[PDB]
Amino acid sequence: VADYSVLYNSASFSTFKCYGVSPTKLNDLCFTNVYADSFVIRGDEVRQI
C-alpha cells in the first residue's frame, strides 16, 4: 500500500510533472505493477525526459 497522497506533499519536489495522471488522483486507482526508475541528471536536462 502506497501513501501517494503524502509523497506528493513533500515540498522538496521542484520539477513534478505527472504526464500519466493528475497527482491528487494517484490515491484511488489500483496499479497492476510499478516501475521505479531512479537516477540523477543535470539541472538543465531535467525536462528533456
Partner: protein, 50 residues
C-alpha cells in the same frame, strides 16, 4: 494557474478552470528582502478539502 494543485495552487488561493485574464509576476526581491526575515507573510497549510 488553472490546472495545478499544491500549497500555492489550492491551499492558499485557487484559479478557476474557466478563468480568463492576466497573471503578472515580477522580481520584488529588492523591497521584500527584509533583514527581519519578512515573516509577516503567512498562508494556511494543507486544508482538509479544496
Amino acid at each position: 494557474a488553472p490546472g495545478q494543485t499544491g500549497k500555492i495552487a489550492d491551499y492558499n488561493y485557487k484559479l478557476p478552470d474557466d478563468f480568463t485574464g492576466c497573471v503578472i509576476a515580477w522580481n520584488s526581491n529588492n523591497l521584500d528582502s527584509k533583514v527581519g526575515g519578512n515573516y509577516n507573510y503567512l498562508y494556511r497549510l494543507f486544508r482538509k478539502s479544496n
